[PDB]
Design goal:
Chain lengths: 249, 249, 250, 249
């Protein structure tokens, strides 16, 4: 009987790529989504047409609040309800937007950027662990956290917190046989609303090929970390950035 | 006239040593505190005896909540109301306690640990910057963040987020001439409630002299970073750890 | 036609496991060695028994010297001579022993530890790149514990740090030629056969993930990933394979 | 009696600023140099005019070779011969030039870049420690070593090695009371042969003031690390880079 995985923010883009590649490897998947209901259901439909009763959707807001723990617990519960087990958690969902130091309130900005990128991963990790084979968690990090975009403090804080979670949880969950690792893209699929000229400015900075990573390339590193070929790896973050983080100003 | 500094959690231990040292260097000081009212008032009294009208107290809970932004605005504002300027911010206040992944409600644990260690520092940084010469911010980090204590995930997340804030704010505030740096203790004054035997266990691990840092030694590094001797340093984090972080398991 | 790989220090242990997995994946290999001559020749023999003329050996001392560049060029040359191409270089060979700051001379310690761990990797990378005439890559065997080093191993540690710098520098510089450069950083893997079990257990007990050392094959699995089409966008990265060891405070 | 310091490559630029400031602080100094004999003697003359018998020169090639240990041993001996003691070692001398992977031989390139930047620091460290109040070593590192200049692999290798030495020697020498630390410039005094256009190009990248560090600014951080205000600091590398290393491509 097939293992099962939760992928957060899996309706589109990198999360969908990761859900698809896990499914093709033999996983049943929970496709978490927030606003993208149609895309989520559409993906689950495609996956179920390939193998029946192997995909489900689960809607959750991952903004920080006093109910975020309940929400995270429910996402994990959804995997146990559909599949009877939960082998892999992929923390992919991420809010990303500028929060200049010098319109959402600042309260909202902190709640969304810290909640999605860091607090929700921690609460999902807690629920995943409490409910417990090749068990692992993969966190989607950011290769450029030490050379950040100007005016993105809250986003940067959240991704650095996520690094701290990866290490702390790797350490504490190791005795339970749960590995915890990260994949850190540089530039991968560009924002939908980004103009082509602005996309090319990013592409030209990448040493390896002057192009963004495909979603599938990101997913490839996720698949490695969840596989038997990574059974000794925990607390590691693999950059998948085409050399981008190595380029000086 | 004399420059002014806000020091958070400045009633006792390291924050106290920082407040004293800045005051001895010629700063007027706001001593922020949460529960230690008697100690804070007592410190202001002692400093004011040295030089009249140079120390005040400001009480605030730095727990994350929808009122935290207003609280942080108020702290900065207290420095302006007392001293008519605010030249230095020291983010020292910190909650610290275990938050096991497998085990106060979880939402309280999040609010306290992430609020004090990261979100309060971000909001203070915003309030400080907006209100704006040798301007700088010093964040109290942690030298052991990459080799964390077992079961301290939320604390570790908060301190990693603080590293992210230090970098992101250094970059963003550099055009305004505000420097942003960190000081990362290893083992300094041990928890008052920790037994002498457990304290000795940590002391024994420290290569440089088999002892913890004094609060004064931590304050020394803060003083350097705020000084004109650090005029070109921003985005740097100075460990003050006696070599502890270099020691393998 | 099959690709070809050079693996340094490939006679035994992790270098051996790397050569074997590459060979199992379809690579032709050069097994470089220094003192383990019988093990190197027998390994290549067992590989050639599996598939004819798919393995050669090349002996070289990788101590720093004025002849080291020539040796390194010859190692790369031996891959082109045998197989007509060189797709993969694995810098695996390593000297490891204490060099306290406070039976070899210091100049010998410098030459062996900096030579094998850093200078020879640089010189091999140079010859590798220059000889290029679809998936080219270099993998450098780093060390997960380089920021929490063993007492009295300054030269070793300096060599492994330099190796980090080479991985980054060569990744940036070689990216325009489509050559990826990455690292694998073991924590504790195969401990010396001769180390007492009670000593081995001291190390094993410190590892979070299973209180055991990595197998050689576990280390090789990461190299195999980095050289594969699943890692085509990865360059300049160093994957720790340490079971959480570098996370553990003193 | 006044303490004594060895500064390598001290005839010009940053090493000169370091020797000057150490001298202004009360230290007697050994001004090591390789080719700059006139500039070295001129500097010794200025310092001895200020305080007689407080400065000496010592010539040495720091290229790697089988006699480099003897040369490093002699530099340390020259401090004992002039001053009767050796309290501080500043590893400042550095060769810097491109060594592309694709008129010096490669053997020479290796010997010069790895010897000056790494092996000579190790051998000086060894001799410093073997001949042994407030003892310390300060290594001049490089803030940009993780985002290196294209075609500078040997230089980068040497500076990364120097980080490893800083850590390993801090750990090993701590029991003897010798601290070991680093200062990592970003862009400071720009090279002798660089056009105005190219100087401005680098200046423009620096967040904090769009200018390079002064030699004195670099020296200020060295002074801090050897001072009594740094007595618990060992194994630390302080970036002095005006935020340069924080800037993405
Ligand atoms: N793409 C890139 O270039 C890079 C990506 N990364 C990281 O890789 C991962 C994937 O990147 P990418 O696919 O571009 O991510 P996206 O920006 O496309 O976001 C992924 C999903 O996050 C979900 N999400 C956003 N806000 C919330 C919220 N409040 N509650 C719940 N879910 C929410 C959304 O779900 P929905 O649509 O259902 O609302 C969204 O589809 C991220 O973690 C990202 O930070 C790192 C660096 C670069
Ligand atoms: N001591 C050490 O060994 C180490 C220290 N550090 C860092 O150095 C800094 C100072 O350390 P140390 O002096 O030991 O710290 P403490 O643990 O003594 O905490 C400092 C102050 O933080 C304040 N604080 C705690 N919770 C809150 C809250 N909810 N709202 C507002 N303020 C709050 C308290 O104020 P009050 O008393 O008024 O209630 C407390 O006195 C901290 O940031 C710490 O993380 C890092 C590594 C180790
Ligand atoms: N095993 C572990 O726990 C760890 C391993 N590593 C790294 O992993 C890699 C593989 O480790 P492992 O298999 O244990 O390494 P070994 O200690 O077994 O050494 C690997 C090979 O290096 C060769 N070598 C040594 N000196 C020279 C020299 N002067 N000239 C040429 N070749 C030489 C030897 O070849 P010969 O036998 O033919 O003389 C030896 O077999 C190394 O780079 C190592 O540093 C990192 C962390 C820990
Ligand atoms: N300046 C900057 O922007 C940056 C500097 N740094 C580091 O800061 C330190 C000082 O920088 P800077 O003053 O610009 O350095 P320089 O390039 O000016 O060199 C310092 C001295 O090193 C000596 N040196 C060079 N080769 C040898 C050799 N073979 N043997 C002995 N001594 C030798 C030279 O002495 P002589 O003149 O007597 O021949 C030279 O004057 C260096 O370690 C450098 O890497 C780091 C990053 C940036
Ligand atoms: C550089 C960079 C980093 C990113 C990033 C885009 C770019 C260009 N993304 C990040 N997170 C999320 N959630 N979405 C997007 C907008 C695609 N991180
Ligand atoms: C190792 C260690 C890390 C610390 C730490 C103590 C120890 C032993 N402290 C931290 N933060 C806060 N707020 N207080 C205290 C308890 C003093 N970090
Ligand atoms: C970026 C940069 C890094 C440097 C550097 C200059 C620049 C611009 N220098 C380095 N080391 C030595 N020895 N001299 C010089 C040339 C001044 N490192």
């Amino acid at each position: 009987e097939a293992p099962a995985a939760v992928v957060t923010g899996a309706a589109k883009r990198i999360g969908r790529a990761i859900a698809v590649k896990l499914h093709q490897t033999g996983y049943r998947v929970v496709i978490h989504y927030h606003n993208s209901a149609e895309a989520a259901v559409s993906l689950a439909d495609e996956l179920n047409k390939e193998r029946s009763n192997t995909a489900v959707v689960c809607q959750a807001d991952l903004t920080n609040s006093n109910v975020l723990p309940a929400s995270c617990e429910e996402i994990i519960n959804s995997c146990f309800r559909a599949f009877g087990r939960c082998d892999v958690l992929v923390n992919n969902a991420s809010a990303f937007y500028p929060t200049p130091l010098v319109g959402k309130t600042v309260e909202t900005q902190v709640a969304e950027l810290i909640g999605t990128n860091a607090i929700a991963p921690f609460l999902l990790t807690m629920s995943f662990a409490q409910r417990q084979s090749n068990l692992s968690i993969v966190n989607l990090c950011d290769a450029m956290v030490d050379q950040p975009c100007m005016a993105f403090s809250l986003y940067n804080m959240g991704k650095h917190a996520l690094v701290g979670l990866t290490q702390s949880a790797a350490l504490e969950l190791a005795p339970y046989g749960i590995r915890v690792n990260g994949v850190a893209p540089g530039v991968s699929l560009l924002p939908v609303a980004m103009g082509e000229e602005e996309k090319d400015k990013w592409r030209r900075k990448v040493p390896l090929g002057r192009r963004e990573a495909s979603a599938e390339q990101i997913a490839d590193a996720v698949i490695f970390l969840v596989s038997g070929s990574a059974q000794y790896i925990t607390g590691s973050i693999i950059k998948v950035d085409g050399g981008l983080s190595l380029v000086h100003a």
